């Protein structure tokens, strides 16, 4: 069958991937006792947008549920799936003649049917008529709450839909649950996004020089990913934190736009991941700007390397993700005590939630078509109201096919440290005279992407990780990638 | 005073630029008979957005009118200007403590006052109280129609605004008119955006090889612009049309995403321009993929070079822009006849609107904070209802301080050519035996950015343009060219 491909060495993604997702969705819906025979899933694709009131077009990236089901790159589409038969119909815009002048070839419906391997293609202006003739019992539309944004996913609508019976409650939890478990075809794409992003991270480590701006490495990363990987988008805005900025978890946004000069002695924390055909990656590498770890940098870094590998070594089906978060906390506290930043009973530190002072974010999250992927908190799974753990993007138990980031870190964040020092229950553990040396250190985060397997995990990421590996990588002479 | 700067060799942009814009706006409003004493201009800045219902942040780019007035890069702001005194107040978001962890330093109001050189800074939730205490006669808000998108610009609103007298008709045409005329400080930035984008176009011409994907050059262009120019954004999505795709005017969007393999014998038409601190550039270079113009390619290319230079040579204050469009049409028709593609009376060809078959778009447009900048069709300026001319983005007369693109082109667009061949009023001019040779040629566009001056124009763009200059550049030559 047909495949998506951007040529050269980029990955061929079979459109059969999306056909399988549609099949899996139907199979799950058929098992739901509330779903009536003759139901039709109706999804609305993303539309083209502009900057504010201007005619400046924004590059179109497909809505994630619609992509998951259909893999369609064009704006203005709808897609439907007959639940009982699995038959798929794509609706494409009926374009005006001038499209041929300004935008490109006006493809036929047959072209799209062949391109996407759906059962039928019709024009968008005919959706009401086509759905009417199919005599559905109910239209199943998509509405639910994203548990990372808190936003409500907005259901499909079209002129004439009011003539139909519409249910907007059944679909969302079911299609979310399908997205949580990656097919082998999806895993091949995530292996690829991790491959290219790993290569790009390595090029960045090789290219970093004292005196560069953070954004020069953001630029290089995205250039490698696009030109060599066909990744036109990043999965999220690149986080290129040097020095104290490495303590800022989502650094790099418009308000703090990767505009610091990298200085001798800085730690770098680069959290970047290219996106291919709307599939994510998310990798974080931490390393000394000047290519040589100081003793303090080595100690902090190897603490996070220890929790990283301990968590990965413990992950397997049945493991409760919050237990892995707490494992990382305990290891960080042990290591920080060995360094002399902390003193006392680590058991007592844990009871006082001291780990969250140093790692205020969740250990890791589902990853897929969205970098913070759906399904972390389905009905019945509750958010734990404790420091650190409350930022976990899932409290589920691990099962095969789940894809997770594993991203422990240790940071020196002034307002968290100061809070802790004011609290007698935590302050006794902190050795101020030692901690003072680490103010402005920033932080270390080591982020791998992994798949849960029957017996443990598969590691998707491949970057240097030991102190020796990193120093060797940065000292490498290889001009494998030299723009200009 | 303070400056915007991204370090290295990037341009320092004084915040005095925006203070001057505010002053110019007030001065214009004070002369406006509809404006009362005690009026306050109220603008609302752009807000942060996400992809659909996800928490995937979209990189924030400021709304263009708000940028013009304040130069503010942070999302969630408002800004007001007291018309009678020119006093400026910036309203910034009151951030949650957790911002310090995830997003970065929670800057003081004084930090922002100093950063932006405004007269006062307040928190956004205090805007109703602050405005109330000033006892304004009327709030002047922004509402009007963009004549390129047809969209209505969104006026500012805040909780409590209903307690004020609000006028939303006066401001838009006045602030648009200010934007039409660039200050010397604004011209410094547009000189810079053209410098970097010109350098990037030159790097692309040096790097292009047969067998590359179009998007590899898009990536390279953007990487040059960001890493060397500090241009995090492009002004619009890169148009990298090879072969037949060079006849597609806005090629490169999601539906036609720069994914063709460049072939020997192809013409390339690359329309790309980096954006610096929300100031545009827009440059188009046309060249043979293999670095050597064929005779046919040379002929089409030099026809557009002739119209380009004729227009630039004719432009000066008082010139009616549609007359320049018609001048380009006439030159294209003359040269196409000189090539044997057309025969007969060129006067008659013009009368038959034959020029629009080969150049279906407008000769050029205002450029500024938006690539298709505001103010092309103010009240009283009408769109000309003829092929080609109706696509003009302005029908104004040129005056000093206007910035325009000059972008004639010749394309071989099958459905337009076939229309002409079916039309007895046009068909006899076309020589099919020669024209058949140019089917699938694509097209040539040569686009310069220029400023209208007292004596003529100032050319901002600096790329190779003659056949010899282009072949030299592609062969790797250092500035082997001299501008018009
Ligand atoms: O947002 C999250 O969950 C992770 C934590 C650090 C950056 N990304
Ligand atoms: O949109 C416009 O006006 C010009 C014409 C060619 C591409 N950009
Ligand atoms: Na991360
Ligand atoms: Na992550
Ligand atoms: Na253009
Ligand atoms: Na243009």
From Swiss-Prot, chains A, B:
Name of this chain's protein: Xaa-Pro dipeptidase
Highest taxon listed in the record's lineage: Eukaryota
Leader sequence residues: none
Gene Ontology CC terms: extracellular exosome
Textual note on the cofactor: Binds 2 manganese ions per subunit.
UniProt xrefs under Gene3D superfamilies: Creatinase/methionine aminopeptidase superfamily, Creatinase/prolidase N-terminal domain
Similarity annotation: Belongs to the peptidase M24B family. Eukaryotic-type prolidase subfamily.
Keyword Cell inner membrane: no
Entry keywords, A to Z: Acetylation, Collagen degradation, Dipeptidase, Disease variant, Hydrolase, Manganese, Metal-binding, Metalloprotease, Phosphoprotein, Protease
Assembly, per entry: Homodimer.
Protein's gene: PEPD
A GO MF label: metallocarboxypeptidase activity
Enzyme Commission number, as recorded: 3.4.13.9
Residues carrying Phosphoserine: 162
Statement: the UniProt record of this protein carries the keyword Transcription: no
